[PDB]
Amino acid sequence: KREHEREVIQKAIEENNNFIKMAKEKLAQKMESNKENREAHLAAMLERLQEKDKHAEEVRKNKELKE
Amino acid sequence: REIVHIQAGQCGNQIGAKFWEVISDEHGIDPTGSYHGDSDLQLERINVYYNEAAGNKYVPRAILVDLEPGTMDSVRSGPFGQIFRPDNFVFGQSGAGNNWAKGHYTEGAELVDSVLDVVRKESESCDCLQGFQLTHSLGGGTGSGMGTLLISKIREEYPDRIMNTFSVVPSPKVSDTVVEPYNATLSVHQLVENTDETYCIDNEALYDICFRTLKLTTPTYGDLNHLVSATMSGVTTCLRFPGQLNADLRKLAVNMVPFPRLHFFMPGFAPLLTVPELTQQMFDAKNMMAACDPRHGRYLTVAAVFRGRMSMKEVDEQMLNVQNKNSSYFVEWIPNNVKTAVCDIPPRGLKMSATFIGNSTAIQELFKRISEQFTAMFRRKAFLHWYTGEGMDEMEFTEAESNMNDLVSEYQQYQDATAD
Amino acid sequence: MRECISIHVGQAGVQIGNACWELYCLEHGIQPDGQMPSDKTIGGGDDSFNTFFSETGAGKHVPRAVFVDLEPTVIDEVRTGTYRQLFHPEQLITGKEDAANNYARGHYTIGKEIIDLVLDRIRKLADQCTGLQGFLVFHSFGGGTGSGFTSLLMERLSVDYGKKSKLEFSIYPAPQVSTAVVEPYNSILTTHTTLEHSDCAFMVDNEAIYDICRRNLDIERPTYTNLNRLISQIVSSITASLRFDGALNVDLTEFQTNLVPYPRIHFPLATYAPVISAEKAYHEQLSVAEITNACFEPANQMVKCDPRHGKYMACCLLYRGDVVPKDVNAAIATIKTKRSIQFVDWCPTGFKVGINYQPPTVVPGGDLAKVQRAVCMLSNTTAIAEAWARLDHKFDLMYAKRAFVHWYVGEGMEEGEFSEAREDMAALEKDYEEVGVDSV
Ligand SMILES: Nc1nc2c(ncn2[C@@H]2O[C@H](COP(=O)(O)OP(=O)(O)OP(=O)(O)O)[C@@H](O)[C@H]2O)c(=O)[nH]1
Ligand SMILES: Nc1nc2c(ncn2[C@@H]2O[C@H](COP(=O)(O)OP(=O)(O)OP(=O)(O)O)[C@@H](O)[C@H]2O)c(=O)[nH]1
Ligand SMILES: Nc1nc(NCc2ccc3c(c2)OCO3)cc(-c2cccc3[nH]ccc23)n1
Ligand SMILES: [Ca+2]
Ligand SMILES: [Mg+2]
Ligand SMILES: [Mg+2]
């Protein structure tokens, strides 16, 4: 009976720690994935605007080499 | 918190000045910038649009831009012309001659950097900038082309701030300048991609209001701008006076824009009383500032703003009544899509008024009209040399036309969608 | 000991917090400067009110509370208002820019910038406790901060304080005072993410409170102030067993044992009586029987649903004031002989009863009458699942078109989070169906 009592209290400790562990790892995975997605959204927007500035330069370089 | 205001070109500067006159009057700010009002409600959110200078002077947070000098003179001599910061005037000499390519690619590109320097100095000292509003027309050369250039450059430096425009759409009834549909299509092509919110202010509708309803036989620019200034005052009321509501431009945008491209709004105003009469009139086609029948489409979202002292119970009951009796005009798959604000402070010269903001698929009628005029010229390549001489390809015209046709098709798609 | 820490999140949470702490001060005789002349143990003690208030050597009685918002204007009103001296400045925490009604900004983009400071201030409060019992968390479902930041905070609290109990008071959206189209999205996202981190949650439907204020207090157009004063009366009924002593008093934790048969089934229905105006309370003394009867009238519920078309799993009665057991027993006998009260077959039908003798209080200038006796019923009924159904349907209508979803994706969320949350709600509705079937 005494050994069973020790197994019960150890199982309770183990389950509390496992719940803490799994919530910590789930949170960390989410908070990384969200950062990566947002930065990729902003990088695509900036890249589209820089491609626009490049096209405006080719236009002015077209008008100069017309004359 | 802080909003930065920009006005570009002749039209943009005239309506900008009227806007600043009307709201300066509402806040009790005189042309010298001193407060002489009668009520603490006037200053509590004053910083949204005004800076504080030494001596408790209030200076508009406003930047004034044109390629044509002299509009600066007319503003400076206007009644409130001394109120503006002198260093905030940025004007060239050349003009743009109603040529979008001059505004966007050549003359305007040279000046844009000096415009951005003033923008940056104003922005750096904001406690917490919410974003930007621009006033311009789409039918000229400076406001359309250089304004959309400014929009693109601002987005590069403040990609996480809100960008809002009040954009005046051309009509043959007010200007006979023949190249206007080209300039409007080219600007709209930019706007679909780079703004969060665009109020379509249509010179067609303003003319028809001045002629038929107000009985003005020969409407001047002053009469059109009186309507525009009353509308713009109405739509900034909820940010400007203390009052039940705790919002910023982003939360408003989040409430009004269900799809990123469909962000072109139809404004209205009433009267041109009782709460039922105001409510009936604000939903009438004849009170809209865009020449569109809302009964030819469906509402994605609506905001209604009432001004004056009245019963809130009665306002609630009437808004529910209009929704119940006009249910077919509201899409069934966005529940609770009609929002209401009440401000106790009436506009000057009225006891009661209503301002309307609609996101309706009937706006396609506006885009169709412009599109027709565009095609009429593009099929004969008329006047195209004005633009190719600045370095532009035909291909850019083809793409702009195609994008506006796509916008139309998308509005039709969401008009036809159902729930089952 | 047995202390409790209160956390008030976003506008609705903060303003409800204001109403609750004002009422607690009136119930215990604490002045706005924090002095309590009746308390003769200076600088400490283990009186029942010390579960909610600590004491300084200078005789000030200080709420065990944190207020959090991502913009400053609501909490600035607390900093300048009547009760500004009650709170230490480190308890009032604000950022500069709000979540704009967007769950994603409150959980990630803006929320990530302030979470560590909030947790450290909470740690400061926890270190002053000699036997901390757990947390009380006040927030809306519909706002960006009340939904997303609360989710984030609950996850971090489970990490830092393990299985330590956490209770919610949750404001469920209604169109009559709602301000955003996207409130159904936020409601499902937060409910999914918090479900494993909360032991018990009391939902308050704004439509039910609005109706009750109009019908019973004759207020034509109720404000937030009216609603929050009534809510605070219900909160006070629930926490009164923690804050006062007495021989017929029954601990709330002991009710939680009875209210929660499975971890996911943890959402009680609250009903409060009497809500009556001064003009009507005059010459009309309400008996134990009248108020106990009113607890089974659906018009008095905090959430719109029909318990007559579900089954009970628990039923608790919390009385306060001039109330003796004999009258309780006679009233219960009558109600059992007269009403549609059907239990599941795996659960006993006895009602659990508590009595606290300290009488109810009202705020000066209020619309509620002072009464000699009041009652709050807490029932675990399957009918509450109707509120989930209403919210899920609105979610489906918009999500089929992806309306407004781009606002969330632009802050870094994925569509997979939308569909995972919606599936978890579907399984919850199924659980509530399964618990009401008979055994075999
Ligand atoms: N409603 C209204 N429309 C105006 C006003 N002023 C000009 N417009 C319209 O603006 C269009 C022409 O654009 P402008 O503003 O004159 O062009 P711009 O920005 O000044 O550019 P440039 O004149 O080429 O240097 C015409 O269709 C006019 O009808 C005004 O005060 N009110
Ligand atoms: N009962 C009650 N509900 C409120 C109160 N204030 C706001 N609400 C409700 O809460 C919802 C809006 O959420 P808020 O608390 O205002 O938003 P928030 O947490 O500040 O989030 P953001 O402002 O978007 O950052 C709406 O359904 C309102 O009806 C209040 O004082 N009492
Ligand atoms: N989208 C949107 N809506 C507006 N008013 C309607 C509304 C009122 C109360 C609401 C609501 C919407 O949503 C919930 O509560 C104004 C604006 C605006 C645009 C440009 C410049 C501006 N300066 C101040 C305002 C503003 N933009
Ligand atoms: Ca003491
Ligand atoms: Mg000009
Ligand atoms: Mg808020």
Side-chain angles (χ1 to χ4, degrees), chain A residues 1-28 30-67, chain B residues 1-43 45-56 58-71 73-84 86 88-90 92-243 245-276 278-420, chain C:
Chain A
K1 195 206 184 310
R2 315 273 74 100
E3 115 189 348
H4 176 64
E5 293 152 6
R6 285 42 172 175
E7 287 146 10
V8 171
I9 189 159
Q10 288 277 30
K11 194 177 152 185
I13 286 166
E14 176 81 75
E15 272 172 68
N16 186 50
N17 293 344
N18 194 49
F19 175 76
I20 288 161
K21 184 188 172 177
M22 272 171 196
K24 194 180 198 136
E25 298 176 345
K26 269 170 180 333
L27 196 42
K30 287 201 292 182
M31 296 298 270
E32 208 61 6
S33 179
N34 176 277
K35 190 178 96 199
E36 295 172 0
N37 294 43
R38 190 172 186 267
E39 284 168 358
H41 197 273
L42 286 162
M45 176 180 330
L46 293 184
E47 266 151 24
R48 208 183 303 116
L49 290 167
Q50 287 144 6
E51 195 290 335
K52 203 182 182 66
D53 292 14
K54 173 129 62 168
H55 170 81
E57 297 272 22
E58 283 137 19
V59 177
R60 296 187 277 280
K61 276 175 212 177
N62 191 17
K63 186 226 176 175
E64 196 178 25
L65 296 158
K66 280 322 157 192
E67 307 163 348
Chain B
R1 200 166 164 73
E2 292 88 359
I3 291 168
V4 172
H5 168 95
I6 302 163
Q7 48 191 69
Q10 171 171 109
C11 179
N13 273 285
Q14 272 151 216
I15 73 174
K18 294 290 150 287
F19 168 76
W20 287 108
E21 290 167 33
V22 175
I23 71 155
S24 298
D25 168 49
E26 293 179 13
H27 291 279
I29 308 301
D30 75 18
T32 71
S34 194
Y35 172 73
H36 62 109
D38 51 305
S39 167
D40 283 348
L41 301 146
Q42 298 177 292
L43 289 184
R45 305 262 75 204
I46 197 76
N47 347 24
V48 58
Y49 280 104
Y50 298 83
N51 290 307
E52 276 182 306
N56 296 112
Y58 297 95
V59 56
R61 194 170 24 255
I63 301 167
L64 297 91
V65 181
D66 207 339
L67 286 162
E68 175 63 60
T71 57
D73 300 85
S74 71
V75 170
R76 210 179 284 103
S77 69
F80 277 70
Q82 194 208 44
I83 210 181
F84 299 68
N88 290 18
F89 289 77
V90 184
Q93 289 85 69
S94 60
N98 292 181
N99 183 330
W100 192 90
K102 281 177 185 224
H104 200 87
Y105 288 123
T106 61
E107 307 298 328
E110 288 173 25
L111 189 70
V112 75
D113 287 8
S114 65
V115 174
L116 292 165
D117 293 338
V118 180
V119 170
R120 193 176 308 106
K121 178 136 63 142
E122 288 289 346
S123 290
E124 171 172 14
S125 303
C126 292
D127 183 43
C128 191
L129 176 65
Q130 37 179 324
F132 303 94
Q133 63 177 54
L134 167 71
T135 53
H136 63 153
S137 73
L138 304 194
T142 299
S144 60
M146 191 186 74
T148 58
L149 187 65
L150 273 163
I151 283 161
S152 296
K153 305 282 185 173
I154 287 162
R155 214 157 92 137
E156 277 183 65
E157 285 173 60
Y158 308 85
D160 65 343
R161 299 296 93 200
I162 295 296
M163 180 60 67
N164 285 339
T165 71
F166 294 91
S167 295
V168 177
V169 168
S171 171
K173 297 180 177 182
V174 293
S175 176
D176 66 351
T177 308
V178 54
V179 292
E180 288 190 318
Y182 286 157
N183 298 326
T185 300
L186 287 166
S187 51
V188 166
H189 182 41
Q190 305 298 307
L191 299 174
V192 171
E193 309 295 334
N194 298 312
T195 77
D196 301 298
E197 280 196 39
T198 286
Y199 294 92
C200 302
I201 298 182
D202 186 359
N203 269 357
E204 187 103 359
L206 303 179
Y207 184 90
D208 292 337
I209 292 167
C210 292
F211 189 95
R212 302 184 183 222
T213 300
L214 304 174
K215 305 277 175 179
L216 305 168
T217 171
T218 79
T220 60
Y221 281 128
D223 306 295
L224 309 195
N225 293 351
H226 274 299
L227 298 168
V228 178
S229 80
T231 296
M232 287 184 66
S233 174
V235 307
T236 64
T237 291
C238 55
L239 308 176
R240 285 190 295 112
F241 291 98
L245 172 73
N246 182 330
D248 67 84
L249 292 170
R250 196 179 298 281
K251 190 184 274 183
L252 308 167
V254 170
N255 279 344
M256 294 300 293
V257 183
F259 308 102
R261 297 165 46 89
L262 311 191
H263 64 256
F264 298 88
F265 308 151
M266 187 179 315
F269 193 103
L272 293 166
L273 282 80
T274 79
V275 176
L278 275 175
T279 306
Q280 191 150 38
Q281 292 180 35
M282 93 189 160
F283 276 86
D284 192 320
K286 296 166 309 156
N287 291 65
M288 301 301 166
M289 306 291 158
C292 303
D293 191 340
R295 290 172 175 77
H296 295 171
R298 303 198 212 268
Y299 289 116
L300 301 172
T301 56
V302 174
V305 188
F306 293 81
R307 299 190 65 183
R309 294 188 64 203
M310 62 190 82
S311 167
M312 188 69 207
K313 181 245 261 178
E314 210 183 359
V315 170
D316 298 338
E317 57 169 48
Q318 294 300 308
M319 286 305 292
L320 291 168
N321 234 43
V322 288
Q323 287 169 90
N324 286 338
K325 299 165 57 171
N326 298 272
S327 60
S328 310
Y329 303 106
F330 298 93
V331 299
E332 52 179 0
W333 44 270
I334 304 184
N336 311 311
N337 59 345
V338 183
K339 301 290 152 180
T340 301
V342 178
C343 170
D344 289 352
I345 303 298
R348 188 178 194 177
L350 299 171
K351 289 281 171 75
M352 293 202 238
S353 69
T355 303
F356 172 92
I357 309 167
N359 193 346
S360 173
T361 64
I363 196 81
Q364 73 177 275
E365 292 182 333
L366 183 160
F367 298 110
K368 281 186 151 165
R369 167 167 66 91
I370 302 302
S371 191
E372 184 167 54
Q373 296 157 355
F374 177 98
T375 198
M377 296 162 187
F378 191 63
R379 70 190 168 171
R380 42 182 227 272
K381 302 171 177 108
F383 308 94
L384 268 200
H385 70 276
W386 282 17
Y387 299 86
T388 188
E390 305 300 306
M392 287 185 70
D393 276 16
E394 263 172 47
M395 185 66 73
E396 197 168 302
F397 281 71
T398 295
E399 291 166 5
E401 175 187 47
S402 183
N403 208 21
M404 193 164 311
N405 293 338
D406 288 348
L407 179 63
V408 167
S409 312
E410 281 147 43
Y411 272 119
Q412 190 59 41
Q413 180 197 329
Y414 290 116
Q415 184 176 311
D416 295 326
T418 62
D420 279 86
Chain C
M1 336 176 307
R2 299 289 65 206
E3 296 89 353
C4 291
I5 289 167
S6 292
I7 306 170
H8 302 280
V9 178
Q11 180 175 124
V14 167
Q15 292 181 336
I16 290 161
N18 290 340
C20 289
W21 290 101
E22 164 173 39
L23 180 58
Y24 296 160
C25 289
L26 294 166
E27 290 176 13
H28 294 297
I30 297 161
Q31 300 167 10
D33 70 357
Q35 298 288 317
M36 181 175 178
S38 73
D39 178 8
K40 310 310 195 200
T41 51
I42 308 82
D46 58 2
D47 297 306
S48 281
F49 60 82
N50 289 126
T51 61
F52 273 58
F53 293 89
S54 58
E55 297 183 40
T56 69
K60 183 179 285 191
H61 292 60
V62 177
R64 297 186 194 272
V66 179
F67 290 66
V68 189
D69 199 0
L70 304 182
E71 57 105 359
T73 55
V74 188
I75 283 175
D76 283 343
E77 298 219 78
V78 184
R79 295 178 175 130
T80 51
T82 310
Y83 284 96
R84 70 180 69 84
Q85 225 176 306
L86 216 61
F87 304 99
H88 189 282
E90 296 191 348
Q91 295 171 45
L92 302 177
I93 303 167
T94 52
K96 285 57 79 183
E97 180 174 13
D98 68 26
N101 288 321
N102 184 339
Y103 175 99
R105 284 167 70 81
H107 192 292
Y108 307 93
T109 312
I110 308 307
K112 83 199 193 178
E113 292 311 328
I114 208 176
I115 184 63
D116 299 317
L117 173 59
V118 171
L119 294 164
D120 291 23
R121 300 290 177 74
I122 290 162
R123 170 68 61 194
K124 288 235 187 112
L125 293 177
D127 291 343
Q128 293 176 348
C129 297
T130 52
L132 174 67
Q133 191 157 53
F135 304 98
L136 308 200
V137 185
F138 294 77
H139 66 105
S140 64
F141 278 174
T145 299
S147 67
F149 189 76
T150 303
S151 307
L152 176 62
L153 180 63
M154 297 287 274
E155 290 176 304
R156 289 294 283 274
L157 291 173
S158 291
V159 176
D160 290 4
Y161 297 91
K163 289 289 191 181
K164 192 64 58 56
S165 40
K166 305 204 284 307
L167 268 56
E168 298 173 270
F169 291 92
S170 290
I171 307 305
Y172 174 107
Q176 295 90 343
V177 300
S178 75
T179 42
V181 182
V182 294
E183 288 190 51
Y185 286 165
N186 293 335
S187 302
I188 276 63
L189 297 161
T190 197
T191 296
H192 165 56
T193 53
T194 296
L195 197 47
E196 285 176 308
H197 300 293
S198 180
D199 301 297
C200 186
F202 301 102
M203 277 187 297
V204 183
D205 177 1
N206 267 346
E207 189 162 315
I209 303 310
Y210 193 88
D211 284 348
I212 287 159
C213 289
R214 290 202 286 193
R215 174 166 62 247
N216 298 347
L217 300 174
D218 311 307
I219 309 183
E220 281 182 43
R221 204 309 192 171
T223 66
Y224 288 142
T225 304
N226 306 124
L227 302 182
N228 294 346
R229 282 178 176 152
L230 172 58
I231 294 166
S232 70
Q233 292 294 338
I234 293 82
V235 175
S236 170
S237 289
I238 290 160
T239 67
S241 57
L242 304 171
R243 296 182 288 109
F244 296 102
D245 186 9
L248 303 177
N249 201 59
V250 169
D251 226 58
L252 183 64
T253 58
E254 200 174 285
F255 291 119
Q256 275 180 273
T257 306
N258 284 271
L259 289 166
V260 185
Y262 308 92
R264 287 159 65 82
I265 307 299
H266 66 231
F267 300 90
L269 181 67
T271 309
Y272 182 85
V275 180
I276 185 180
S277 77
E279 297 71 60
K280 301 182 196 172
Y282 188 63
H283 294 168
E284 287 255 354
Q285 174 191 17
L286 296 102
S287 72
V288 176
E290 293 165 314
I291 67 172
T292 304
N293 243 284
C295 291
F296 294 87
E297 180 35 66
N300 302 84
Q301 295 163 187
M302 284 318 99
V303 177
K304 285 195 154 42
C305 62
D306 191 8
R308 309 173 282 199
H309 300 130
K311 288 188 192 193
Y312 288 86
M313 291 167 284
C315 185
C316 304
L317 291 165
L318 291 55
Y319 289 94
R320 78 193 298 185
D322 178 43
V323 176
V324 295
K326 158 167 199 180
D327 298 327
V328 174
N329 296 326
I332 289 169
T334 74
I335 287 296
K336 289 215 199 203
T337 71
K338 292 185 192 298
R339 286 188 186 268
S340 43
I341 305 156
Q342 174 90 317
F343 282 76
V344 301
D345 71 2
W346 55 260
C347 165
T349 63
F351 294 8
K352 191 175 161 68
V353 173
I355 296 165
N356 212 276
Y357 297 121
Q358 268 103 353
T361 306
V362 296
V363 171
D367 311 296
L368 280 153
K370 182 174 276 221
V371 298
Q372 284 185 114
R373 61 194 74 79
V375 65
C376 185
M377 183 163 88
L378 305 175
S379 53
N380 184 13
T381 170
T382 54
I384 207 163
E386 291 178 14
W388 305 133
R390 289 191 306 272
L391 218 45
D392 289 340
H393 181 62
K394 288 176 194 294
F395 180 105
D396 294 344
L397 278 173
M398 286 189 302
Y399 193 74
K401 272 78 193 166
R402 301 304 188 267
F404 305 95
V405 167
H406 75 278
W407 287 110
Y408 295 75
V409 168
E411 300 286 1
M413 284 183 70
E414 300 174 344
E415 284 191 1
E417 299 172 73
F418 278 74
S419 57
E420 164 190 330
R422 182 58 181 92
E423 270 148 44
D424 189 24
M425 294 309 294
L428 189 65
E429 291 191 47
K430 202 157 187 297
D431 297 322
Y432 270 93
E433 201 180 310
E434 275 151 9
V435 299
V437 175
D438 293 302
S439 310
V440 300

